[PDB]
């Protein structure tokens with residue numbers, strides 16, 4: 001069947017949109033930035049709709065059946081509970097999109113009578129009706145990118161706030177338990193960046209002759225079939241559950257997850273979906289389990305020797321025993337053919353790598369830096385151009401949600417985070433006098449809140465003390481930040497190093513947590529190094 005059907009009505013915005021920042025004609029830097037940086041808007045929504053609309057074909061085999069049976073068996077050992085109406089209301093984030101029924105996240109969170117009783121009828125309706133399609137809204141995401149053409153806008157498909165609370169009642173406990181239970185160590189979302197690196201280093205070292213590859217499915221959400229979604233439901237039903245959860249899970253699968261009509265921001269019918277909805281509670285878990293099932297089966301079909309797998313939604317990495325370059329190349333082609341048969345076709349074909357550092361997954365790669373005594377430290381990095389471009393977007397566009405503080409947290413050991421992002425961020429917090437204030441930031445389709453003064457403790461907990469002493473960066477990391485700065489029209493590293501010395505001194509002068517930030521985060525900026533010791537604060541819980 002077709003992944004989507006369309007009526008011709010536009011995917012409409014709800015906010016003012018901007019494809020490009022206005023150019024300053026007397027600035028060459030403004031010109032370089034204008035030539036390279038763009039924001040996705042509703043205007044490209046139709047181009048995305050064309051790319052994601054296609055017929056799916058699925059051919060399953062004994063390799064697929066065998067893997068599916070094993071994950072159902074592991075799922076059968078899990079016991080999960082219903083969340084009460086109150087717990088599910090409490091799990092709603094402060095600014096979750098308001099309901100069409102005249103109530104927002106504030107009424108849900110505070111348990112206001114009308115919001116609670118509206119959700120109660122949505123819940124009872126799921127128990128008595130297993131068939132009526134649930135309506136959804138389709139919206140074009142506004143994301144900043146750097147060219148090399150332009151990526152069209154990604155689409156978000158989500159049900160009403162009242163339905164979102166009900167999904168949590170039925171499946172929240174499952175999302176917190178099922179992935180780790182059925183995938184074990186392969187479950188990608190259980191690791192901090194230092195633990196992920198440790199996992200990859202152990203996977204690499206345990207092979208006699210390692211080979212690794214990453215796989216990208218072309219438009220994964222659209223490749224998910226109705227049969228794939230009903231299979232996810234049978235995985236969920238393999239768990240031990242209250243009968244009320246079983247009924248609600250079945251109704252959610254048939255009325256929402258398998259498909260349904262999509263409406264734009266104006267209430268006009270946009271189309272009909274017959275694939276994965278991007279904005280449902282089960283998107284991340286469903287994608288991770290389904291990608292894992294299809295990939296493990298494809299590994300068996302291709303004759304991949306001793307695979308160690310790491311799965312993050314549709315992002316997958318397989319580290320295995322190399323059979324030599326010719327056989328590895330034949331095996332990756334057979335893996336791709338099996339993946340395509342299972343309806344998970346490739347975007348870019350996979351390539352075997354014989355150095356862990358050469359694999360790109362979740363836009364990232366492992367890099368090596370030397371410590372002050374010459375010890376090799378391994379950490380995750382990425383090309384810094386798009387994160388730096390996103391950081392710059394907000395200097396002319398003061399957004400209430402920062403789209404680059406997530407980079408400081410995830411990529412804290414990197415040259416580009418330490419020298420540029422940290423320097424710029426702490427500078428702007430001191431100019432605005434917002435240092436000690438909690439701020440909102442986006443991280444993998446979620447709006448988190450963090451206090452900037454807690455950054456040294458958060459970083460040590462997620463990366464270790466090593467994040468504050470990556471002394472000698474690789475030639476590639478050095479070239480990557482220098483080219484990114486040049487391409488965006490930004491000042492070079494020598495300027496950032498001078499600015500960091502002033503930022504370090506200004507933070508130290510404020511004392512307390514601001515002085516800890518200055519001493520730990522900017523030790524790279526001084527020749528007379530302080531001896532950085534473990535933070536007792538890092539021995540606290542962020543998760």
Ligand SMILES: CCNc1cc2oc(-c3ccc(F)cc3)c(C(=O)NC)c2cc1-c1ccc(OC)c(C(=O)NC2(c3ncc(F)cn3)CC2)c1
Nearest residue numbers: 188190191192193310312315316317359361362364380410
């Ligand atoms: C570093 C850039 N990000 C990432 C870099 C990555 O590089 C590879 C990777 C690269 C090369 C390889 F050869 C193999 C693999 C990844 C992979 O697994 N591909 C299969 C991968 C995933 C993320 C990622 C995604 C979502 C997250 O979050 C959902 C997080 C996170 O770390 N979130 C945080 C947290 N999560 C869990 C936890 F317990 C503590 N902290 C801190 C807030 C990270």
